[PDB]
Structure formats: C-alpha cells, structure tokens
Design an enzyme around this catalytic site. Structure first.
Site, mmCIF file in Angstrom:
data_model
loop_
_atom_site.group_PDB
_atom_site.id
_atom_site.type_symbol
_atom_site.label_atom_id
_atom_site.label_comp_id
_atom_site.label_asym_id
_atom_site.label_seq_id
_atom_site.Cartn_x
_atom_site.Cartn_y
_atom_site.Cartn_z
ATOM 1 C CG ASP A 143 92.999 20.922 29.270
ATOM 2 O OD1 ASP A 143 92.133 20.311 29.917
ATOM 3 O OD2 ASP A 143 92.372 21.855 29.271
ATOM 4 C CB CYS A 180 115.269 41.584 36.347
ATOM 5 S SG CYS A 180 113.660 41.819 35.724
ATOM 6 C CB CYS A 215 113.162 40.073 38.832
ATOM 7 S SG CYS A 215 112.709 39.128 38.136
ATOM 8 C CG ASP A 263 96.335 26.362 32.616
ATOM 9 O OD1 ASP A 263 95.652 26.117 32.930
ATOM 10 O OD2 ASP A 263 96.223 26.727 32.685
ATOM 11 C CG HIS A 317 110.167 39.569 33.481
ATOM 12 N ND1 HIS A 317 111.201 40.106 34.821
ATOM 13 C CD2 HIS A 317 108.978 40.436 33.670
ATOM 14 C CE1 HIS A 317 110.372 40.849 35.645
ATOM 15 N NE2 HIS A 317 109.614 41.299 34.581
ATOM 16 C CB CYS A 335 114.375 36.454 35.916
ATOM 17 S SG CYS A 335 114.058 38.027 34.756
HETATM 18 C C1 LIG Z 1 91.183 30.476 31.018
HETATM 19 N N1 LIG Z 1 90.160 30.354 31.859
HETATM 20 C C2 LIG Z 1 89.685 28.944 31.515
HETATM 21 N N2 LIG Z 1 90.677 28.192 30.997
HETATM 22 C C3 LIG Z 1 89.864 26.628 31.230
HETATM 23 C C4 LIG Z 1 90.345 25.319 30.634
HETATM 24 C C5 LIG Z 1 91.707 25.182 30.254
HETATM 25 C C6 LIG Z 1 92.757 25.072 30.729
HETATM 26 N N3 LIG Z 1 93.973 26.016 30.095
HETATM 27 C C7 LIG Z 1 94.347 24.623 29.508
HETATM 28 C C8 LIG Z 1 95.747 25.033 28.625
HETATM 29 C C9 LIG Z 1 95.240 26.604 27.601
HETATM 30 C C10 LIG Z 1 96.128 25.451 25.838
HETATM 31 C C11 LIG Z 1 96.690 24.454 26.455
HETATM 32 C C12 LIG Z 1 96.493 23.956 27.569
HETATM 33 C C13 LIG Z 1 89.246 24.644 31.144
HETATM 34 N N4 LIG Z 1 89.980 22.946 30.256
HETATM 35 C C14 LIG Z 1 88.958 22.499 30.773
HETATM 36 N N5 LIG Z 1 88.951 21.044 31.143
HETATM 37 N N6 LIG Z 1 87.533 22.462 31.800
HETATM 38 C C15 LIG Z 1 87.145 23.770 32.142
HETATM 39 O O1 LIG Z 1 86.446 23.478 32.622
HETATM 40 C C16 LIG Z 1 88.687 24.627 31.613
HETATM 41 C C17 LIG Z 1 87.958 26.074 31.965
HETATM 42 C C18 LIG Z 1 89.269 26.937 32.179
HETATM 43 N N7 LIG Z 1 88.784 28.214 31.919
HETATM 44 CL CL LIG Z 2 94.011 21.105 25.668
HETATM 45 ZN ZN LIG Z 3 113.142 39.687 35.638
#
Ligand SMILES: CNc1nc2c(CCNCC3CCCC3)c3nc(N)[nH]c(=O)c3cc2[nH]1
Ligand SMILES: [Cl-]
Ligand SMILES: [Zn+2]
Ligand SMILES: CNc1nc2c(CCNCC3CCCC3)c3nc(N)[nH]c(=O)c3cc2[nH]1
Ligand SMILES: [Cl-]
Ligand SMILES: [Zn+2]
Lengths: 370, 370
Positions: free
Chosen positions: A93, A310, A305, A267, A336, A307
């Site tokens: 990200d 399990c 599962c 993710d 898991h 894994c």
């Molecule tokens: C949980 N909700 C949510 N996450 C978003 C995320 C992060 C996704 N997860 C990345 C990992 C978090 C820890 C390390 C990388 C979003 N990231 C960006 N750049 N823009 C969003 O609009 C954006 C929107 C999001 N909404």
């Molecule tokens: Cl990040």
């Molecule tokens: Zn499992």
C-alpha cells in the site's frame, strides 16, 4: 520467463471472474486473498507456512517499514523479499491510509502528508520511492482515503486531489526504469459513496492508465449494505480487462458478495489480527475459541478444513493455549484462519470456473449464518 | 518393541559416558538436553520443530498443568502426548520445586505442601498421580529442593524428609500397574553442598531403587565453581549403571563441565526463555540480537549452525523482529537456541564416542570465552 504483468480471465459468471495474474516472481490466482504483514512478517507465521496455506501474494506494510527498520535500510539489505524470506509477489500500500488512521498529528497539503511517528513526510513521489526501495511487485498509487461519512463537496475535493496524486504516482513510477520494467502500478478509485464522483475518478484513472484498479474509500464504517450498493455501480466503471482490487475487505461474506460484484483481489488484517484474539473462522460461522464450551472439545477448529492445524490439534488444546497466552496459540489460530481464507478463495475460483458460483454463494451464506 | 526402560553405555572417557535410553515411546541419546515446556507447549515451537532440532525427549510442566488446564482434564482428553502432539518420551518434574519458587503462600509439612495458585495440596502420592494423569514417561520422585545456602542441620533435615518422600513416591508409582509397567521413576539426591549428606542421600535412594538418579538441589545460586565441586564427589555416589540427571542445568559451559563429571541428562529453561529476550547462543559465546551492531549484519545468528533459522534468515532480520516485538522473532530465536543446544549435545556424544571429549571441552571453552 513470466511477463512483468499479465492478467488473463479464464471464466466468468455474471460479474464474477476467475483467472490469473502472471508476474516475474510468480502467478496469482484470482479471485485472490492477500495476507497482510505487520513489520516484514505475516504475524506468527514463517513464509513457508504462509505459502503452505495457499497464498500466492502477501502485502508488505509500507507505513510500519518506512519507520522501522526504514526503507533505505531494507534496500541496503537486499530488499523486502530477501529480508523476510518470501520470494513470491508482494503488494505494498502507498502509506497515506495508515498515516491518516494511525499517526498522532497529521498535516495534509497538495504536496502530501507530514506526520509524527507513534516527523516524516509522505508525498506521491516519496511513496513510490519507498515502495521501490522495498522491492514491491505491485505498487499502489498514493491516494487519500476519504473519511466516512463525507459531504459531496468534501468527497469531490478529496477525490480530485487523489486523481492529481495518481498522475504524480504514475510519472514517478515511470521515471524509475528498474521499477517500471519489473513492477506493476495500480490506481485507486475514490469518490466516497457518490456515483458521479466514482465515475469521474474511474475516468481519470483510465485516462492515466494503470495495470490494475483498486476500489478505495470503502470498509471505513459504511457497513455491508452500503458497501455493496457502492460496488454495484463502481466496479463496472473500471476497465473490464484489468484486475479489480477491493482494499481492506474483509469478512468471508464480504468477500463472497464483492466477488459477485466483480472484485478480483482482497486484503484484510482480520484473519491474522482476530485469530490472535481467539476468533477462528469455520464454515458454520466464526467461533471464539476462548469460550468455555471448547475446553474439552476434541474436534478440530473446523470439521472440513484441510489445514495442518485441523489435521493435528483439537479445539480443546487451542482453547488452552489462547487462554494461557501461549505463542503457539497465536501461531495455530493464524495458520488456520489464513488457510480458511485461502480455501474460501479456492472454492470461489472453482465454482466460477464451473458456472456454479451463484449456487455456492447461496449455500455458503445459508450455512455460515445458520 | 522397545522395553519400558533400558539404559546402555556405548562409550566412556574419564567420568563421561555416551549411550542410549530405550523406552516405549522412543530412544533418548545421552548425554541428552531436554527442552522444557511452559503450558503443554515448548514456547513458540510446533512439536515437529522441536523434533527437527534434534530433541529426543521434552519436559512437561507439572506445576503449570495441574493448575491449568488440570491433570484430570488432560487425562480425560487422552493425555499430554495426544493433547500437545508430541509422541516421543516426556519427563515431568514432581512440582514441589516450582511450588516453593513460584507460589505465593506455602505451608510445608511431612504430608507435602499446600499452596495458593498465582488453594492446592501436593504430596508424594498426589505428585505421582498427577504425573500419571499427564501420561509422563519419566516420572520424578516428589522431593524438597533445599534452599541455598543451607546450614548443615537444615540441609540434613530437608534431605531426610526428601528420602522419606522418595520411598513414598516409589510405593505410589509401584501401586499403579499401568504406570509401573509403562513409565520409569527417577529418584532425586539432595544434601545441599555437604559430602556426607550427599552420600547418605545416594545410599537411601539406591536402597529404594530407581530407574535413574537425579542430582537435585543445585543451580540454586551457588555458582559454577561450587556446583562443579559438589558434582565432583556427588555423581560417583550414584549407581554407575543408571542415568544421572542434573536438574535445571544450564548454560553451555555448565553442561560441558557436568558431562566431564558424569552427568547424562539435562533440562533448562535458558534456551527458550532467553531467546525470547534476544539472547542467541553461538560457538563464539552468546550475543544479544537487540544490540544495534546487528541492525545491518547479513550473517546468520551463528556461522556454523545447521538449523533452519541460520540457513534462511539474517541477524539483521531477527534483530528487527525482536526489536519490533514480533512473534516470529521469538519463534526464530527459540528454534535456533534449542537447535544450538542439540548440536552441542551431538558434539559431546560424538567426541566421547571417539575418545576426544577432553580435547573438545578445551577447544569449546577457548572459543566460547575468547
Ligand atoms: C480496513 N478498511 C480499509 N482498508 C483500506 C486501505 C488499506 C488496505 N490494507 C492495507 C494493509 C494495511 C496494513 C498494511 C497494508 C486503503 N488503502 C488505500 N491506499 N486507500 C484506500 O482508500 C483504502 C481503503 C481501505 N479501507
Ligand atoms: Cl501502508
Ligand atoms: Zn484449519
Ligand atoms: C534452575 N535450577 C534448578 N532447577 C531445578 C529443578 C527443576 C528442573 N527443571 C524442571 C522444569 C522447570 C519448569 C517445568 C519443569 C529441581 N526440581 C526438583 N524436583 N528438585 C530439585 O532439587 C531441582 C533443582 C533445580 N535447580
Ligand atoms: Cl514442575
Ligand atoms: Zn541456528
């Protein structure tokens, strides 16, 4: 040898697609779930274990890593892949989302964001550079995740800034020959819950041109009904022939419904974070292994599962480990949960390939929420 | 099929011996290092990983397990082996040592010890029963570890009580047909630092008769010089044809010197506990991986170690993980440290078998303390 980036769609059912992304470091089966790292590690798992669960790609943690150990240091040590021992694709990200959610004091401007570590600057150019130093395979444009709820005026101004930053991200990525030749760049659609702004954002991103398109600005408190409503109109706005990545999603039922709406990549910290807190995913819904009802339950976490957890250990054992605060409890719960997520993705891919995904979604929901 | 218990000595050099203990659940190579569990787990390691490091036997934690999840519950779930997924021999301590070191309020009498959990009773009979319920393969007699320093009078009174408890332990073990036929029972020598009391204790234990003999009451603050001095006269008092187990020892140099004095078996929390705190064992002495000097060190923890951690990850990565508080840091440090201990034991066994252990001990010390 594999290409820098190629997305191929092998089968479709309604808006759902299944296929592959080929990159230099490996193939990614879609729809894909991408486990998320904390600080150059997927919590409590060796990389070989992450791979054994079925993951084709993981997320690095740009925000954490730029602070510690530092992006320049990781580059000097040979890059994130070498450092953590994961040789397959890594998506990073762009860092601003986490800055705005985690940092203590933030100062936002057209140039980027300045913030204090829990002082540092983050701009489109610096974000792309950090992701390069980490050696990311899928680089995210530097965007602003508009808070929810947002007024139409503020959502528009925010989305407009994100689109200017998307062009700056594109140009920074393209200026760096090694990055442009070996990595891919995804743009991030913004626009809050507003169809016209989502359309303007999609149009701006397509004019710039990206290897994949993320739906940003969701999973920020709007709830599943509203998220699905926004996906209904937003995903069709993105180029059909490129991957569609829903950032930060989500629970198993969120994933199923998002695939029904055309999402190819996901993710979420949920399986890793909540496993450590005792939540285990099962085909009959989540359970909290800390509950006393599991203290003498000899069944595995989930009856189907496949894994390794399990296959070997009981609910009763894992209940005891988590109650005792034992590290092995976190290891087993996390393996898991990530394996469960990968089995969900495999069932999704297989059912689309066989033209029975709609039935799978109905059967999955009936049992998961029974 | 293997016997209940058979100790065979294959080679000797001075007081040092190398050989094997055969039991129903497996063979134990001696001199042996036995990793120690916390709560039905060796901290941060799957049992398959413990085995991969070379361990032939592990210790269960009677004191922790009798409190949580409870010995009766573990028995109802099929025993400790099934519960934690370790199918090889398990040795259990008798619990009183830990009660006297960890419990808040203790009440000692000829019957046993009552204590409050951080109320419960522990007697010779109850200790043997708990170890049976856990399904231990090597059962320790219930003893009293005399505090150090001790006056001759108090050491004598304490040792005398321990010898009465040793006979009660023997009789409790023998009364239980399944335990007597499938497990082994070790007696524990006491007597503090006093040669005459050590002799009386050895004589009492030999008259009762045990499958193996532990040297108790050491590694309780006396320091290595004094420990070695007591071992010099105490180990020869034990039956030569049975294993000699030094409880709670120790650092690598403690182990080498104890083998030179006739010890065959060791347990210690040090490699597991101190790995989590950043201490890694190497042939050039311990290092603290948290030190800034390791932040960019691409070498493995130890340049010769054959463990999986040293094959894959750098000091710099593990330094970062431990500094970040990451679970994977504890996993990797613990696997390396236990593997290092097992490689030490293998070098000890091989050098005795080849008649070059004295030279190995000299070379080991010169490099470890250089
Ligand atoms: C949980 N909700 C949510 N996450 C978003 C995320 C992060 C996704 N997860 C990345 C990992 C978090 C820890 C390390 C990388 C979003 N990231 C960006 N750049 N823009 C969003 O609009 C954006 C929107 C999001 N909404
Ligand atoms: Cl990040
Ligand atoms: Zn499992
Ligand atoms: C560290 N020093 C030391 N330990 C001793 C121990 C315990 C050995 N380690 C057992 C594991 C600890 C956690 C679970 C089992 C001793 N135990 C007994 N019964 N008697 C001793 O004199 C005795 C003496 C010991 N001295
Ligand atoms: Cl104990
Ligand atoms: Zn090693």
């Amino acid at each position: 040898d594999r290409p820098r980036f190629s997305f191929s769609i092998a089968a479709r059912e309604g808006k759902a697609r299944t296929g592959t992304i080929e990159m230099k470091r490996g193939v990614i089966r879609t729809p894909a779930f991408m486990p998320v790292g904390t600080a150059a590690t997927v919590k409590a798992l060796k990389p070989e274990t992450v791979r054994a669960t079925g993951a084709d790609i993981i997320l690095g943690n740009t925000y954490h890593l730029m602070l510690r150990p530092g992006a320049e240091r990781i580059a000097k040590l040979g890059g994130l892949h070498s450092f953590m021992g994961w040789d397959r694709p890594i998506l990073t990200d762009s860092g601003g989302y986490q800055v705005m959610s985690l940092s203590s004091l933030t100062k936002q401007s057209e140039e980027g964001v300045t913030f204090k570590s829990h002082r540092h600057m983050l701009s489109p150019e610096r974000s792309i550079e950090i992701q390069h130093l980490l050696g990311s395979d899928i680089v995210m444009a530097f965007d602003e995740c508009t808070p929810y709820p947002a007024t139409p005026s503020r959502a528009a101004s925010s989305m407009e800034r994100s689109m200017r930053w998307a062009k700056r991200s594109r140009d920074a990525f393209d200026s760096r020959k090694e990055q442009a030749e070996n990595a891919a760049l995804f743009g991030i659609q913004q626009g809050s819950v507003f169809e016209n702004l989502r359309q303007q954002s999609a149009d701006a991103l397509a004019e710039i041109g990206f290897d994949g398109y993320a739906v940003g600005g969701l999973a920020v408190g709007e709830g599943q009904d509203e998220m699905f409503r926004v996906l209904d109109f937003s995903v069709p706005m993105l180029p059909d022939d490129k991957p569609h990545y829903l950032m930060g999603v989500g629970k198993p039922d969120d994933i199923v419904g998002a695939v029904e709406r055309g999402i190819d990549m996901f993710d979420c910290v949920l399986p890793t974070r909540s496993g450590r807190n005792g939540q285990a995913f099962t085909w009959d819904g989540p359970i909290n292994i800390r509950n006393a009802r599991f203290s003498e339950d000899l069944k595995p976490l989930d009856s189907e599962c496949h894994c390794a957890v399990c296959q070997k250990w009981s609910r009763a054992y894992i209940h005891h480990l988590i109650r005792a605060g034992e590290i092995l409890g976190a290891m087993l719960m996390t393996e898991h949960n990530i394996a469960f997520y990968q089995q969900l993705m495999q069932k999704i891919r297989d059912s689309i390939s066989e033209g029975r995904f709609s039935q799978f979604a109905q059967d999955f929901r009936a049992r998961y929420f029974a």
